[PDB]
Amino acid sequence: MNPPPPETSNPNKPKRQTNQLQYLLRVVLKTLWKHQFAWPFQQPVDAVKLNLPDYYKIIKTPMDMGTIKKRLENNYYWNAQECIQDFNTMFTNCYIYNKPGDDIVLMAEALEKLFLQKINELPTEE
Ligand SMILES: COc1cc(OC)c2c(=O)cc(-c3cc(C)c(OC[C@H](O)CN4CCN(C)CC4)c(C)c3)oc2c1
């Protein structure tokens, strides 16, 4: 069985909409979301359909771009670093669970290269 997905809504968590967070949605997430390798990362890993009974025994902090997209659209974050960590968690989970040469790993690295190139020009806070 799959665990419940990460939280995307929490009304007692403080939130805001900084220009950095707008950039993470409009530049960073949109760039990765449209990429040819985005599809495995657009929703939580469905370990049941994929028949990976051990995935959520090894991956204790799941994350994915569907969760990140909902969080940005919901203005769930307080700062840019919370959102950047989610991306890095999602990439790291992939490298942690899988074999170094795997397709899913190459897909992850292609998205992460773009991720790094975009956050390198993260604007200073307005
Ligand atoms: C869709 O979205 C995502 C997103 C993901 O991360 C974002 C991942 C991910 O992390 C890795 C896997 C995955 C890994 C193996 C190893 C596998 O293969 C298991 C199969 O039973 C056959 N192999 C078993 C091992 N035997 C040695 C050889 C055969 C399958 C089907 C998927 O899928 C993902 C899908």
Q: Kindly list the domain boundaries of the chain, sorted by start residue.
A: 18-122
What is the token pair recorded at 60? 């204790």
Distance (Å) from CA 122 to ligand 1 centroid: 33
Q: How far, rounded to the nearest angstrom, does the alpha carbon of residue 120 sit from its chain's CA centroid? A: 17
Token pair of 124, please? 């200073």
Residues whose CB is less than 8 angstroms from the CB of residue 48 and which lie 6 or more positions away in sequence, other chains included? 1, 2
Alpha helices in 13-122 (DSSP H): 19-23, 30-34, 47-50, 55-58, 65-73, 80-97, 103-119
Tokens (6 digits) for 16? 């805001």
Question: How is domain 18-122 classified at the CATH fold level?
Answer: Histone Acetyltransferase; Chain A (1.20.920)
Q: Please state, in angstroms and rounded to a whole number, the distance separating the CA atoms of residues 56 and 54.
A: 6
Gap between the Cα atoms of 8 and 34, Å rounded: 21
Give residue ranges with CB within 6 A of ligand 1. 40-41, 45, 50-52, 94, 97-98, 104
Q: Quick one: resolution in A?
A: 2.0
Q: How many residues are there in the chain?
A: 126
